[PDB]
Every structure is written in C-alpha cells, then in structure tokens.
Amino acid sequence: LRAEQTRATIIGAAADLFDRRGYESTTLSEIVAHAGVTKGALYFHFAAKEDLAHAILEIQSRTSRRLAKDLDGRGYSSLEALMRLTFGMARLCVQGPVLRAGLRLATAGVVRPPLPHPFTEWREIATSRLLDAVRQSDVHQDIDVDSVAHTLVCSVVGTRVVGREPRRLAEMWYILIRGMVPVTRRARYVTLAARLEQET
Amino acid sequence: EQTRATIIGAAADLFDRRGYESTTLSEIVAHAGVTKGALYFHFAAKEDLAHAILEIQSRTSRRLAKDLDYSSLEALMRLTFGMARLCVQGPVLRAGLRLATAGVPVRLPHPFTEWREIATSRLLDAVRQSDVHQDIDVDSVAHTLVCSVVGTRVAGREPRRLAEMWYILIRGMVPVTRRARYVTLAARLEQET
Amino acid sequence: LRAEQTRATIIGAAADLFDRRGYESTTLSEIVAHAGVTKGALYFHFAAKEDLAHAILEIQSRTSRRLAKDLDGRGYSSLEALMRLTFGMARLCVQGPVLRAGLRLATAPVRPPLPHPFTEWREIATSRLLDAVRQSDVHQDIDVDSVAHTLVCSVVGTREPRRLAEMWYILIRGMVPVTRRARYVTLAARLEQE
Amino acid sequence: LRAEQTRATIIGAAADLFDRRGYESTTLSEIVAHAGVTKGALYFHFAAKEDLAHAILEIQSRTSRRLAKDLDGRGYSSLEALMRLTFGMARLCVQGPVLRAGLRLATAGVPVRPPLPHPFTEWREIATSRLLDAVRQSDVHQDIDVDSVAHTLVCSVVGTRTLEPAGREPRRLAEMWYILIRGMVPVTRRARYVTLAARLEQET
DNA sequence: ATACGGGACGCCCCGTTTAT
DNA sequence: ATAAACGGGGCGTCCCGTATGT
C-alpha cells in the first residue's frame, strides 16, 4: 500500500547494508535511518531482524526460480539456458543490492526449513540442467556431472565476487566451456558468453 | 606464550562457529579457562585476536609455499591440495577463511589478494616454462582458481572436488601432451586422505 | 450500546491478565490478543491502558455500594450488617476475576474523584462501627480503628472464611459487651459460605 | 573492595524506589540515577534486575531470623518474644527502605530463579511456633485456634498503608496488638502486655 | 473502528579502562 | 593476568495517533 512502498524500501535499505557490512554488524537503526523510516514503522513489518535476513533470502530463492521459468519454452538449448540463467542472476547483483545481499547471507545461518538454503536450489538446478545438456550431445558423456555442478556454484560465487562481476562470470564460463563442451560446440557458446556479458 | 595459544585456539573455534561479530569476550574468556584480565593483557582488543588469527594463516601460508624444490604448475597444483588439507587441520586456519568471508578488518597484507597474487606468480612461471599455454590469461585463471577453492560449503567431497576441477583447468589450459602427467597427479593428490 | 458486549469482554480478559501477569507486566499485545479484539477496537472503547485499570476499580466500588446498600435494606443490626458485608465483599473476591484484579490494582494510581478503595473501605467500616456503638452492640470506649488493614490480607497473603470468622471471634470478644457476644459469634460461625 | 559500598548503595537505591513505585514500574535508569552508579557498575553486581529483587528479598528473610536469634537468651518467651520480634521488623521498616521494599515485593510479583525464600510461610511458621508455645505457658487459651491466629496475625501485620504516612507504622502495630490481646490472652495477665506494647511503641 | 506508522525507552550486556 | 567500574548502544516492543484502500 503505502505499506508495501515502505515494506520494500526497508528491505531495500537493509539489503544495501547487509551486503556492504554483514547481518551481524548492521545496526537495526543504521537501517531505519538509511531507509528513512522509524523503529516502529520497521517494527510493523519486521519484529526480529532475521525477519529481514529471512525475507531477503526469501526474494533471492524466489526470483531465481522466476528466471528458471522465464527461459524454457523460450526455445533454448539446455546449456544455453543454465548459462544465460546465471548471467540473469549476475544481471541483478549488478543492479540493486537485494541479491548481492542474499548471497552474503548465505554464510549466516542466523538455516531452518522449509527455508530455501540457497545452494541445493542451485546445485540441483544445475546438476539437472547439466545432466540434461549431456543429452543434446553438448557436454561429454564421460564427465562426472555432479562434480562439475559443485564447482560451478562457487566458480559463480567468486571472491570479491564473494563488479565487474558479469565480466568475471563471463571468463569463468570461457575457462569452463573450453574443456567441457566438445570441439565444435565451443563456437555457439564462447560467442554466447561474450554477448551475454556485453548486455546482461 | 602457552596461554597466548590457548586464547586464540578458543577464539578461533567460537569465531568459525558463531561468527566474529557475535562471539563475545565473555564467551572467549569463558571457553578458554583464562580470566578476562588475562585476555586483555595478551591482546589489546577483540580485533587483535582476529588479527592474530589472520597472522597464523597468512604466515603458515608462505611456510607451505616454502616447499618449492619442482614444476611451477606442480607446486601450485599441490599448493592447493595442501592448503585445503589444512583449512580442515583445526579451527585457527579454517577460522581464518571465516574471518576472510566476513567483513575483514586488516593490518597484514590482504586476505585473497595475497592468494590471487601467488596463483598468478606460479601460473606466470608455468607459462614461462611451456606447462601452460602462452595465451591463456593468467589472472582470469588465478582468480577462478582462488574462488573455486571454496567449493560451496564456506563433507568428504573435498580433494574429491579439487581433483575434478583441476581437470577442467588442465583440459583447456595445458598442452595436449603435458596434460596427462598433471591429471594422474591430481588423481594422486586426491588420494591424500 | 448493545455492542458494549465487547467492552465487557475487553475488561474480562484485561482483568484476568492483570491479576495474573500484573498491571504493566501485562501488555496491550496480550490483552487484545486474549480479548479476541483488534487494538483499534480497544482504543475506540478505552482511551488508554489505565482507562482499563480505571474502568475496573469503578466496577469494584460500584459493588461496595450496590452490595452494602442491599444489606442495610434488610432489618439488620449495624454490627451485623458490618460483618455480613465483610463476608459478601470477601466472597466476591473469592470468585470474581474482575475484582481479584480490583484488589491487585488497589495494592500496586486511582483517577479522581474516586476515593482510593482502601480509604473508602475504612471510612465505611468506621461508619458502621460507629453506628453499632450508638446501637450499643460495641463498647463505647474502643477506638473505631481497629479497621480495614486486618481484613484485606486475609485474601492478599495468599477455604478462608474459616480465617475470616476466626478474626471476628477475636474482635467480638473485645469490643462487644459480654452479654451480646452470644449472637454475633454464633452468626460469625454460621457465616461460612453458609 | 569497597565494591561493597556501591553494591550496598545500589540496593538502598533500589529498595527505596522498589518501595515507593513498585518493581515493574522502576527503571534501571532511575536506579543508577539514584545510587549514583553507572549501568555497568550496576551490572557487575546484578546481571538481571530480578537479581536486584531476589537479593533484596534475601537481605530481608536473613535480617528477620537475625531477630529470631537476638530475641532469645531468655529475653522473654512465646508472646513476649513474638511481640517485640514483630516490633523490631517494624522498627527497621521505619528507617531501612530495604525492609519496606521487602514486603512490597511479597505482595506484587516475585519473579523466577531458585529458590525465593517465601516471606510468609516463613512467618506463619515462626508465629504458630511462638504462639502455640504460649498455650504451653497459658498466656493464651486452650480453646484458641492457634493456626487460625497466625494467619490472622501475619495478615494484619502487613496492614496496608505510602497509602498512609510512614512513621505511623509501629503506631498501627501497637493497636493491632492491643486488639489481639483481649481476644486471646488470659485476663489474669493482659497487664504485662498492654504496657509492653504502648511502651515499646516509641522504642524498638 | 484497520492498518500502518511513530517514537520512546527498557533491559540487557558488551568491550573496556582505573584503583592498584 | 584481578575485581570493580564504565558508558555506550543493541534490540525489542510497547502504547499510541494519523491516513485508510480490505
């Protein structure tokens, strides 16, 4: 209402700090200052402050699945999905901090079910989208699919990536494509990555 | 001192488990046997424990790097594997990454742009000596190597992870011939458990 | 209002929480929570948290009267009336959730004019005691107070009429001329819920 | 150290406040204001503010049988002890706000933590004992229902009153005694007490 | 009278120096 | 390495009035 307008602002302003400072070290009032609200306006929306943690993870674990849908019957090859998908994730990290923050909160456990825990969400989404891309040839039917997925996930996670980071993800792809996709396929994809990094 | 190791050992445990920011002195002092005054006399402030943990790491980092004697790519390969073996060998070193993950306050060099700088030096030397193709881009590779060595957890699949990732690096990076040694090498370092 | 039913039931849960949690130990959160009522419903009815404490003392003192002026409706002896009352009043607090609270808030800020219940009570026992002296049931020599301090804790320092009778026994024995102790004691005995 | 000074001061401060204004309704800030200490000085000595109440209750229950003790060495018996024994507590009530807050805490909420020495089933005891021994000294009547009188006694001892002006406190108890004698005491020797009360009023 | 927003503190307790 | 004291917020939440889109 005026309610969501605020409720959002808050998460906004919280996700900014949480990303730049940590759950732990962001003052519950450095938030209510930086979102221009009041303790009690905040309170209506968030009683505890892992009510913020939680609703910030909430969004990430959601809008991930919302991109996983936004490109299927969009006519894409298995890999091309999973790849473009990650530039999608990378898309928003770059613009507005909610996601930026959600990543940083996946070192909190400030994890209680049916909360996402946002890694199986991705392992499984890639352990699948890969285990599928070894179908349309496109991979190598010799590879340990599971092991690559486990990698991909931090590979993604980065280090000042833990930007300029779409850029990084781009290279990461390259390093991974070369020596995962067969000789010929490397075409479609290297170009795919460079173009994905250009605009995403 | 002995008690000085004791305060850190306790501090590092509680840190890597509860986090720095929410580990209180009371609890460190508590879970250490040492008095509060004892604590403060050894270190000036809560952060100084955080410093002195980064110290152990950043130190014994190079203490392992001291074991260059060896293919530039091999040291670097093995360096990984050893480093990972350690980040389990007690809290101290493990808690070092934990403090790195969080808001690092430093000064010490810098936490990862030590590591990444190392990765590069080795890789540059590998390229200097044919083991790695000239027109890979080292830093792109340094970086990704520096990250990927977090995996996902940040629990037996650990060499079982590097090994596998090293392969992917080898497959695009190294010459086609020299490629083989380095793989059976990675298989073998995985067999240090 | 017909839909005062709410205000009845707001005070209902309000009163119960007070004599269990306490006054401020009890929060609006839990009152409306308990009540089965919106905050806003409560604020339309009462103005502020004290207004509920206030609303309660009122319900109490409006039974001090309501019940005192219905004993001296009968043909009663003043000193009889007086003890009659010290049993009625102490029987309500035995089972009234709304007056238990009345007590609990008396012990722990009463809005004027309302006279702090205790002094209300003492000047009533006085009133009646002084009457019974004129009737000659109580000796003409004893300092009327004595009074209401006695009879309060008898709940507060938590079957109990048996203790309330007990104290009459002691009182009657010292103030009521020797002749007339008969009646009152037998009556005090009789006044046990029965 | 003269931590004990502050430590004690705080409890003065707290008891004075706890007495005038209730437990619930006194702030740890009004307390630090009053004892002139800093929040962390108060914290050293008391973590929770229940500690501050439980330590006051203690300092009160302990202070009472220190009067069950001192009032022996055949310093009377049964009624005579019991009688001045009360007057003594009422004597400290009159100055030490710590004792005042003592009762103020029994009536309101006395919070959790082991054990909380319940100040009443304490007194029912000390009294039923002391009284039920003046049956054994025909200072009472064989007929008098001892346990009924203890509950009565303790009850009226608390009185209510500031609901009524402090210092008129042993004054009350004086009357309350008077009324109880008569009711309970052999005619033959009510004397001994009526004097022991009205003199004993101004001095305990 | 609903939802929403508003401040105000209360308590806890935490990371530290003086008395030493 | 003391025991005692120190301020300084953190979070929670409480008791309330201005806008209110069910």
Author numbering:
A (entry chain C): 5 to 114, 116 to 167, 175 to 212
B (entry chain D): 8 to 76, 80 to 117, 120 to 166, 174 to 212
C (entry chain A): 5 to 112, 115 to 164, 176 to 211
D (entry chain B): 5 to 165, 170 to 212
Any passages from the paper?
In S. coelicolor A3(2), a total of four proteins CprA, CprB (the coelicolor pigment regulator proteins), ScbR (S. coelicolor QS receptors) and ScbR2, have been identified as GBL receptors. The structure revealed that it belongs to TetR (tetracycline repressor) superfamily of transcriptional regulators (TetR-FTRs) comprising a DNA binding domain (DBD) and a ligand-binding domain (LBD) at the N- and C-terminus of the protein, respectively. The DBD recognizes and interacts with the cognate operator sequence (OS) through the helix-turn-helix (HTH) motif, whereas the LBD regulates the DNA binding activity by interacting with its cognate inducer molecule. CprB consists of 10 α-helices, among which, three of the N-terminal α-helices α1, α2 and α3 form the core DBD, with spacer helix α2 (residues 33–39) and recognition helix α3 (residues 43–49) constituting the signature HTH motif, commonly present among transcription regulators.
The crystal structure of CprB in complex with the CS was determined to a resolution of 3.25 Å. The asymmetric unit of the CprB–CS complex consists of two CprB dimers and a double-stranded DNA. The DNA sequence used for complexation was semi-palindromic (5′-ACATACGGGAC*GCCCCGTTTAT-3′, where the asterisk represents the dyad axis) and has been previously shown by Sugiyama et al. to bind ArpA as well as CprB. In contrast to the apo form of the protein, which is a dimeric unit, the CprB–CS complex was found to be a dimer of dimers. Both the dimeric units are bound at opposite sides of the 22-bp CS and there are no interactions between the two dimers. Comparative analysis of the CprB–CS complex and the apo form of CprB was performed using LBD domain as a reference frame. Binding of the CS to CprB induces a general pendulum-like movement in the overall protein structure as shown in Figure 1C. A twist in the dimeric interface results in a coordinated motion of the DNA binding HTH motif about the connector helix α4. This motion facilitates a snug fit of helix α3 into the major groove of the CS, thereby aiding DNA binding event. The ligand pocket volumes also change from ∼635 Å3 in the apo form to ∼750 Å3 in the DNA-bound form, indicating that the operator-bound form of the dimer is a more open structure with an increased accessibility to the ligand-binding pocket. The average of all the roll and twist angles in the DNA are around 0.9° and 35.5°, respectively, yielding a global bend of ∼3.5° in the DNA as compared to the standard B-form. The CprB–CS complex is stabilized by a total of around 35 phosphate backbone and 20 direct base contacts, shown in Figure 2A and B. The direct base contacts in the monomers are mostly through the residues K43, G44, Y47 and F48, whereas residues H49, Y47, T42, S33, T31 and K53 interact via the phosphate backbone.
